[PDB]
Amino acid sequence: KALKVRTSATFRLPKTLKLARAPKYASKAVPHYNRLDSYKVIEQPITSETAMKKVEDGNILVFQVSMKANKYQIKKAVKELYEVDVLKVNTLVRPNGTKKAYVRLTADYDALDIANRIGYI
Amino acid sequence: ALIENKKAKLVLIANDVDPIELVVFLPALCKKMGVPYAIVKGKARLGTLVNQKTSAVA
Amino acid sequence: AAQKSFRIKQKMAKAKKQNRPLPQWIRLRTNNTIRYNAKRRNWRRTKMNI
Amino acid sequence: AGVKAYELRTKSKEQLASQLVDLKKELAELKVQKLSRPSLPKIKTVRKSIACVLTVINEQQREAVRQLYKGKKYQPKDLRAKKTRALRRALTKFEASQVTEKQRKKQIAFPQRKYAIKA
Amino acid sequence: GAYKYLEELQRKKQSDVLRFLQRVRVWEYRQKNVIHRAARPTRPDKARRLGYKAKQGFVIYRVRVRRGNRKRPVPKGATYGKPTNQGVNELKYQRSLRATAEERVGRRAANLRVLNSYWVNQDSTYKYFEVILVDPQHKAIRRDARYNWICDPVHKHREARGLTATGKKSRGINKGHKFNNTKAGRRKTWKRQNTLSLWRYRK
RNA sequence: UUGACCUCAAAUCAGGUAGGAGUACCCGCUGAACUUAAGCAUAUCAAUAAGCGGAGGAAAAGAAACCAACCGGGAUUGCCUUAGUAACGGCGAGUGAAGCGGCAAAAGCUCAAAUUUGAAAUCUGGUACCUUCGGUGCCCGAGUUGUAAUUUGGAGAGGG
RNA sequence: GAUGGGGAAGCUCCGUUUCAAAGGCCUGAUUUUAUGCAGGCCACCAUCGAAAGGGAAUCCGGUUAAGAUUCCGGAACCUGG
Ligand SMILES: [Mg+2]
Ligand SMILES: [Mg+2]
Ligand SMILES: [Mg+2]
Ligand SMILES: [Mg+2]
Ligand SMILES: [Mg+2]
Ligand SMILES: [Mg+2]
Ligand SMILES: [Mg+2]
Ligand SMILES: [Mg+2]
Ligand SMILES: [Mg+2]
Ligand SMILES: [Mg+2]
Ligand SMILES: [Mg+2]
Ligand SMILES: [Mg+2]
Ligand SMILES: [Mg+2]
Ligand SMILES: [Mg+2]
Ligand SMILES: [Mg+2]
Ligand SMILES: [Mg+2]
Ligand SMILES: [Mg+2]
Ligand SMILES: [Mg+2]
Ligand SMILES: [Mg+2]
Ligand SMILES: [Mg+2]
Ligand SMILES: [Mg+2]
Ligand SMILES: [Mg+2]
Ligand SMILES: [Mg+2]
Ligand SMILES: [Mg+2]
Ligand SMILES: [Mg+2]
Ligand SMILES: [Mg+2]
Ligand SMILES: [Mg+2]
Ligand SMILES: [Mg+2]
Ligand SMILES: [Mg+2]
Ligand SMILES: [Mg+2]
Ligand SMILES: [Mg+2]
Ligand SMILES: [Mg+2]
Ligand SMILES: [Mg+2]
Ligand SMILES: [Mg+2]
Ligand SMILES: [Mg+2]
Ligand SMILES: [Mg+2]
Ligand SMILES: [Mg+2]
Ligand SMILES: [Mg+2]
Ligand SMILES: [Mg+2]
Ligand SMILES: [Mg+2]
Ligand SMILES: [Mg+2]
Ligand SMILES: [Mg+2]
Ligand SMILES: [Mg+2]
Ligand SMILES: [Mg+2]
Ligand SMILES: [Mg+2]
Ligand SMILES: [Mg+2]
Ligand SMILES: [Mg+2]
Ligand SMILES: [Mg+2]
Ligand SMILES: [Mg+2]
Ligand SMILES: [Mg+2]
Ligand SMILES: [Mg+2]
Ligand SMILES: [Mg+2]
Ligand SMILES: [Mg+2]
Ligand SMILES: [Mg+2]
Ligand SMILES: [Mg+2]
Ligand SMILES: [Mg+2]
């Protein structure tokens, strides 16, 4: 018979039960594959007269990398395609559109031994 | 249609109807036609004997 | 200039790769009416207007 | 050389995935050799081969989805027959053949009879 | 049916009973929004003879329009022209306010089609209309061949082209010698009588 | 204490729809002035340009609250013609239809207002199954403030 | 400069907290279990807006044909877990 006591002078929206999605059909019905593969992060080795001086002397393995890749996706792509640990990942956007990647390897892993192993020197 | 043919015995009228123009002429029809009419509270207890929701007359 | 956004720098790459002459094998093709590059842009005369 | 499309439909999802990894090592070794020699036309006949493997895999995945939505309503939108927007927001052939029950009695009793003038 | 009794009761608008319901409803509808959903028709006799069926899809909206003339939107009453068109305040808006009431509920509910409308109540500041709308994508309307014509795409936004009961009235589409200026369309009968037709073999 | 109704909300709840583009043609709103009147203000340009809203392959109109005054005609649209006439206009400049007749084309109709009352007979959705641009069965709901059948003025209904 | 709203035939205008039911953080409960619920609290009420305002934290030496407090060598700091 008695009503509910209200200690506050403001009526607000009551918390209701919000249901989760139980859809009748998938939105696109196909799980799309990896848009940026491990073979799509790295795309071209850079062989200039200055990039080869960083391989032999500075222990810097220079790659050309796509525009949709950060420093995270370059480090896990060298460790997967080569099994070579990476200390730092250094990126710059080239003035002609693409992105240059300076990857310095560890002291235990030499950069000249991986250069002639894959084919560019 | 049953009041005009003198076929009604007991007519119930619900006061809960918000479109009141549906129900103002029902005591007027039962007065001239000699039909005894009753006014009951709530159209909700009229839908319990008929298994509906709105059962304004019976 | 020298402290810019990516969208302004993005059009500089297209503007740099178009500042070049015709390839040497173009003029030798069958039925070509192209004699020179008429869209050569110079930074001194015609500014790109971003 | 290049791969052929009819010889890729007889392989499983594991075998087409294992073929696709080996084809990306083909670009990873020949883009290294692209800067050594001035002309390499061998890279063109393998980037169309990866476009053929990615078509057969995308064909086998969509046909696997079409066999479990077969025979029931509410199929996904890209699997639906599109054919335009304007006819999808239109009356179907069953709903346009819906004649009312009053006109149905008139069509049975008095249809459009045939007649001719000969004699 | 009892709707014949509602037909004669509605005609006595200045009666003692319809002056009480006029004042309660003009206050209730003014405290609500301009365009809001009406979950039940308040005049079940008028809507039914306009095409209301109590099923899923027929939706009643209640709409409010301002009252009065159309002031010209020129800045500070400046015309910059001939003194014939110099007037500002006394322009009187060649469409009906019943048709403007149908148009404002069309932009808010673009997935429904305006069938008809009717007056319910008014005061010195507003006019109140209950506008009936039909949902075409509902399956009871796609079936039930009494109302399958509204799904045809030539009936998109009938309130904006003048195809309703107040649209054909404001356009003035009737039969008669008085309706010679517009009988099948004013801008169509204007071009049939000023087109200089030059034939092939010219008379 | 518990079960309903009415009204109003909340949702990355179940699945459906518009919004933009084009815009020659078409349906409305809104709307000028230069020019003409040998000036100019009514008029004219013009119920036009521009602006704005909304459709289709056509749109729109459409089966009379019609035209007629006759021995009457008989939805609408298009053309020939009526006619550059009736009429409008500082009757100043200018503006200006419609009925009939000939022809192209011709196709008509249905909703409420009635008691199914000896039986909401009607419909959406969910689910299972299948000859699945759909049907049957089942379970909730919409609905008696009225969903099918019957008739809608040319008729027609209730009885014999 | 959206939204709730209020104008406007309309393109859109006003307002931005105003006649709005406008929201999210700590912890406990579980040992079929995943995150529903008991609280105790809190009503703040979009978002954009100054590479010279406010604003966490790096230095020195060496190095390139052209790069730096960004690379190298050495030595520090800050934030988050
Ligand atoms: Mg950087
Ligand atoms: Mg700078
Ligand atoms: Mg200069
Ligand atoms: Mg210049
Ligand atoms: Mg500029
Ligand atoms: Mg589409
Ligand atoms: Mg669709
Ligand atoms: Mg009267
Ligand atoms: Mg409803
Ligand atoms: Mg002026
Ligand atoms: Mg003007
Ligand atoms: Mg008032
Ligand atoms: Mg029509
Ligand atoms: Mg005229
Ligand atoms: Mg017209
Ligand atoms: Mg002419
Ligand atoms: Mg003329
Ligand atoms: Mg001719
Ligand atoms: Mg001549
Ligand atoms: Mg949802
Ligand atoms: Mg549009
Ligand atoms: Mg337009
Ligand atoms: Mg017009
Ligand atoms: Mg005008
Ligand atoms: Mg001119
Ligand atoms: Mg003049
Ligand atoms: Mg002159
Ligand atoms: Mg002059
Ligand atoms: Mg004038
Ligand atoms: Mg003139
Ligand atoms: Mg005029
Ligand atoms: Mg225009
Ligand atoms: Mg089209
Ligand atoms: Mg058509
Ligand atoms: Mg045609
Ligand atoms: Mg008729
Ligand atoms: Mg006769
Ligand atoms: Mg005729
Ligand atoms: Mg004359
Ligand atoms: Mg003149
Ligand atoms: Mg004259
Ligand atoms: Mg005129
Ligand atoms: Mg004739
Ligand atoms: Mg027909
Ligand atoms: Mg009926
Ligand atoms: Mg604003
Ligand atoms: Mg700022
Ligand atoms: Mg900011
Ligand atoms: Mg700053
Ligand atoms: Mg600063
Ligand atoms: Mg230094
Ligand atoms: Mg250098
Ligand atoms: Mg320098
Ligand atoms: Mg360092
Ligand atoms: Mg150290
Ligand atoms: Mg720490």
PDB file of C-alpha atoms in Angstrom, chain D:
ATOM      1  CA  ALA D   1      54.923 -20.936 -66.421  1.00  0.00           C
ATOM      2  CA  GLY D   2      52.416 -19.986 -63.735  1.00  0.00           C
ATOM      3  CA  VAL D   3      49.744 -22.046 -61.986  1.00  0.00           C
ATOM      4  CA  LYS D   4      46.438 -23.121 -63.542  1.00  0.00           C
ATOM      5  CA  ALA D   5      43.016 -22.556 -62.013  1.00  0.00           C
ATOM      6  CA  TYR D   6      41.534 -26.032 -62.539  1.00  0.00           C
ATOM      7  CA  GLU D   7      44.434 -27.783 -60.771  1.00  0.00           C
ATOM      8  CA  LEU D   8      43.936 -25.734 -57.582  1.00  0.00           C
ATOM      9  CA  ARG D   9      40.317 -26.760 -56.894  1.00  0.00           C
ATOM     10  CA  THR D  10      41.353 -30.371 -56.190  1.00  0.00           C
ATOM     11  CA  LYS D  11      43.413 -29.362 -53.132  1.00  0.00           C
ATOM     12  CA  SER D  12      42.419 -28.897 -49.506  1.00  0.00           C
ATOM     13  CA  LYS D  13      42.581 -25.734 -47.411  1.00  0.00           C
ATOM     14  CA  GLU D  14      45.879 -26.870 -45.880  1.00  0.00           C
ATOM     15  CA  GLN D  15      47.456 -27.628 -49.267  1.00  0.00           C
ATOM     16  CA  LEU D  16      46.384 -24.317 -50.814  1.00  0.00           C
ATOM     17  CA  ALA D  17      47.752 -22.479 -47.772  1.00  0.00           C
ATOM     18  CA  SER D  18      51.068 -24.342 -48.030  1.00  0.00           C
ATOM     19  CA  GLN D  19      51.250 -23.470 -51.739  1.00  0.00           C
ATOM     20  CA  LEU D  20      50.553 -19.796 -50.969  1.00  0.00           C
ATOM     21  CA  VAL D  21      53.457 -19.494 -48.503  1.00  0.00           C
ATOM     22  CA  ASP D  22      55.925 -20.890 -51.063  1.00  0.00           C
ATOM     23  CA  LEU D  23      54.740 -18.372 -53.666  1.00  0.00           C
ATOM     24  CA  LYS D  24      55.445 -15.445 -51.325  1.00  0.00           C
ATOM     25  CA  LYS D  25      58.995 -16.706 -50.852  1.00  0.00           C
ATOM     26  CA  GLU D  26      59.200 -16.523 -54.658  1.00  0.00           C
ATOM     27  CA  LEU D  27      58.636 -12.755 -54.577  1.00  0.00           C
ATOM     28  CA  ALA D  28      60.872 -12.435 -51.508  1.00  0.00           C
ATOM     29  CA  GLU D  29      63.804 -13.885 -53.488  1.00  0.00           C
ATOM     30  CA  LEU D  30      63.132 -12.300 -56.901  1.00  0.00           C
ATOM     31  CA  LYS D  31      62.609  -8.765 -55.602  1.00  0.00           C
ATOM     32  CA  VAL D  32      66.111  -9.219 -54.195  1.00  0.00           C
ATOM     33  CA  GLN D  33      67.229 -10.225 -57.697  1.00  0.00           C
ATOM     34  CA  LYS D  34      65.222  -7.385 -59.275  1.00  0.00           C
ATOM     35  CA  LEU D  35      67.867  -4.811 -58.321  1.00  0.00           C
ATOM     36  CA  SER D  36      70.744  -6.984 -59.576  1.00  0.00           C
ATOM     37  CA  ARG D  37      69.725  -7.331 -63.249  1.00  0.00           C
ATOM     38  CA  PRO D  38      68.199  -4.390 -65.185  1.00  0.00           C
ATOM     39  CA  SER D  39      65.237  -6.372 -66.573  1.00  0.00           C
ATOM     40  CA  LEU D  40      63.353  -9.264 -64.975  1.00  0.00           C
ATOM     41  CA  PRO D  41      60.055 -10.234 -66.672  1.00  0.00           C
ATOM     42  CA  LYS D  42      59.864 -13.407 -64.533  1.00  0.00           C
ATOM     43  CA  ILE D  43      58.182 -11.514 -61.672  1.00  0.00           C
ATOM     44  CA  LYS D  44      55.036 -10.873 -63.724  1.00  0.00           C
ATOM     45  CA  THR D  45      54.131 -14.553 -64.209  1.00  0.00           C
ATOM     46  CA  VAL D  46      54.088 -15.244 -60.444  1.00  0.00           C
ATOM     47  CA  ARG D  47      52.145 -12.245 -59.086  1.00  0.00           C
ATOM     48  CA  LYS D  48      49.244 -13.404 -61.259  1.00  0.00           C
ATOM     49  CA  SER D  49      49.732 -16.887 -59.797  1.00  0.00           C
ATOM     50  CA  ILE D  50      49.203 -15.555 -56.265  1.00  0.00           C
ATOM     51  CA  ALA D  51      46.092 -13.776 -57.582  1.00  0.00           C
ATOM     52  CA  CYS D  52      44.902 -17.195 -58.813  1.00  0.00           C
ATOM     53  CA  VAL D  53      45.558 -18.995 -55.513  1.00  0.00           C
ATOM     54  CA  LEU D  54      43.765 -16.217 -53.593  1.00  0.00           C
ATOM     55  CA  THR D  55      40.788 -16.651 -55.947  1.00  0.00           C
ATOM     56  CA  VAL D  56      40.431 -20.425 -55.453  1.00  0.00           C
ATOM     57  CA  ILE D  57      40.762 -20.084 -51.655  1.00  0.00           C
ATOM     58  CA  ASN D  58      38.173 -17.294 -51.644  1.00  0.00           C
ATOM     59  CA  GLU D  59      35.994 -19.517 -53.851  1.00  0.00           C
ATOM     60  CA  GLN D  60      36.210 -22.552 -51.540  1.00  0.00           C
ATOM     61  CA  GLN D  61      35.541 -20.484 -48.409  1.00  0.00           C
ATOM     62  CA  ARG D  62      32.405 -18.807 -49.783  1.00  0.00           C
ATOM     63  CA  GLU D  63      31.008 -22.087 -51.126  1.00  0.00           C
ATOM     64  CA  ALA D  64      31.486 -23.645 -47.680  1.00  0.00           C
ATOM     65  CA  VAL D  65      29.345 -20.860 -46.190  1.00  0.00           C
ATOM     66  CA  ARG D  66      26.648 -21.253 -48.888  1.00  0.00           C
ATOM     67  CA  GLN D  67      26.112 -24.939 -47.887  1.00  0.00           C
ATOM     68  CA  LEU D  68      25.086 -24.173 -44.288  1.00  0.00           C
ATOM     69  CA  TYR D  69      22.803 -21.240 -45.118  1.00  0.00           C
ATOM     70  CA  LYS D  70      21.238 -23.395 -47.848  1.00  0.00           C
ATOM     71  CA  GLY D  71      17.594 -24.201 -47.232  1.00  0.00           C
ATOM     72  CA  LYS D  72      16.914 -21.529 -44.613  1.00  0.00           C
ATOM     73  CA  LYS D  73      16.045 -17.845 -44.442  1.00  0.00           C
ATOM     74  CA  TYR D  74      18.252 -14.895 -43.416  1.00  0.00           C
ATOM     75  CA  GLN D  75      21.342 -15.385 -45.534  1.00  0.00           C
ATOM     76  CA  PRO D  76      24.101 -12.739 -45.256  1.00  0.00           C
ATOM     77  CA  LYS D  77      23.973  -9.669 -47.446  1.00  0.00           C
ATOM     78  CA  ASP D  78      26.935 -10.253 -49.772  1.00  0.00           C
ATOM     79  CA  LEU D  79      25.604 -13.758 -50.462  1.00  0.00           C
ATOM     80  CA  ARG D  80      22.223 -12.323 -51.490  1.00  0.00           C
ATOM     81  CA  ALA D  81      21.350 -11.732 -55.127  1.00  0.00           C
ATOM     82  CA  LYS D  82      21.758  -7.979 -55.502  1.00  0.00           C
ATOM     83  CA  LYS D  83      20.723  -7.311 -59.147  1.00  0.00           C
ATOM     84  CA  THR D  84      19.915  -3.591 -58.255  1.00  0.00           C
ATOM     85  CA  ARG D  85      18.647  -1.630 -55.251  1.00  0.00           C
ATOM     86  CA  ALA D  86      15.344  -0.512 -56.779  1.00  0.00           C
ATOM     87  CA  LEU D  87      13.894  -3.977 -57.458  1.00  0.00           C
ATOM     88  CA  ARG D  88      14.837  -5.174 -53.967  1.00  0.00           C
ATOM     89  CA  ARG D  89      12.621  -2.382 -52.612  1.00  0.00           C
ATOM     90  CA  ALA D  90       9.760  -3.655 -54.758  1.00  0.00           C
ATOM     91  CA  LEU D  91       6.850  -6.092 -54.712  1.00  0.00           C
ATOM     92  CA  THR D  92       7.819  -9.723 -55.261  1.00  0.00           C
ATOM     93  CA  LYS D  93       6.137 -11.962 -57.838  1.00  0.00           C
ATOM     94  CA  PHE D  94       4.051 -13.616 -55.130  1.00  0.00           C
ATOM     95  CA  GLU D  95       3.005 -10.271 -53.612  1.00  0.00           C
ATOM     96  CA  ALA D  96       2.171  -8.700 -56.985  1.00  0.00           C
ATOM     97  CA  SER D  97       0.034 -11.728 -57.895  1.00  0.00           C
ATOM     98  CA  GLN D  98      -2.015 -11.173 -54.720  1.00  0.00           C
ATOM     99  CA  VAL D  99      -5.484 -10.381 -56.064  1.00  0.00           C
ATOM    100  CA  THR D 100      -8.211  -9.578 -53.549  1.00  0.00           C
ATOM    101  CA  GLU D 101     -10.903 -12.129 -52.786  1.00  0.00           C
ATOM    102  CA  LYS D 102     -13.668  -9.938 -54.243  1.00  0.00           C
ATOM    103  CA  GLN D 103     -11.909  -9.595 -57.611  1.00  0.00           C
ATOM    104  CA  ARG D 104     -11.056 -13.320 -57.541  1.00  0.00           C
ATOM    105  CA  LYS D 105     -14.774 -14.142 -57.800  1.00  0.00           C
ATOM    106  CA  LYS D 106     -15.080 -11.793 -60.794  1.00  0.00           C
ATOM    107  CA  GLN D 107     -12.187 -13.387 -62.687  1.00  0.00           C
ATOM    108  CA  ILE D 108     -13.621 -16.894 -62.286  1.00  0.00           C
ATOM    109  CA  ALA D 109     -17.205 -15.938 -63.152  1.00  0.00           C
ATOM    110  CA  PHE D 110     -16.438 -13.551 -66.035  1.00  0.00           C
ATOM    111  CA  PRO D 111     -12.915 -13.826 -67.514  1.00  0.00           C
ATOM    112  CA  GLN D 112     -11.747 -12.116 -70.720  1.00  0.00           C
ATOM    113  CA  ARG D 113     -13.522 -14.312 -73.252  1.00  0.00           C
ATOM    114  CA  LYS D 114     -12.488 -14.608 -76.898  1.00  0.00           C
ATOM    115  CA  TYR D 115     -14.752 -13.782 -79.829  1.00  0.00           C
ATOM    116  CA  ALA D 116     -14.505 -13.244 -83.573  1.00  0.00           C
ATOM    117  CA  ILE D 117     -16.558 -11.870 -86.461  1.00  0.00           C
ATOM    118  CA  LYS D 118     -16.916 -14.477 -89.208  1.00  0.00           C
ATOM    119  CA  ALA D 119     -20.635 -15.095 -89.751  1.00  0.00           C
TER     120      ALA D 119
END
